[PDB]
Amino acid sequence: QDWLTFQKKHITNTRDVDCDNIMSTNLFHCKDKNTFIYSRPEPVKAICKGIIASKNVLTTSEFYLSDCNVTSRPCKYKLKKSTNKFCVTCENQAPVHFVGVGSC
Incomplete structure (x- = not known):
């Protein structure tokens, strides 16, 4: 938000x-x-520089991602690590929502 x-x-x-x-x-x-981005916040914030009105943007660079995926046991997860580009909703120069991995 x-x-x-x-x-x-x-x-x-x-x-x-x-x-x-x-x-x-x-x-x-x-x-x-839930997808977590393993990075300093600045490289993340930079994705949205200069974007004012709400707009989905796919990162130009790749980032370290750590996803928590539920198993067959409720509230018990598997950590999956990967490297990929991601889509975020940019608003007033900062990411406000996570859209998805690999594409907008």
Whole structure:
């Protein structure tokens, strides 16, 4: 919804996200999946530089992604690490929503 929230939901300090821990918190409330971007925030913010009105943009560069995917056991996950481009909703120069991996 805003940069601060996007940060809280999608930027990670570690590639090895503890899915079973984080996913069970109120922010995620055992949802099926969540994509975390392993990067300093600036390279992420830069994706949206100069974009004012809401617009989906696919990153030009590739980023380290860590996805928490639910298994057959509710609220129990598998961490999958990958490298890919991603689509974000940019608004007033910052990412406000995560769209998807690989394409808009």
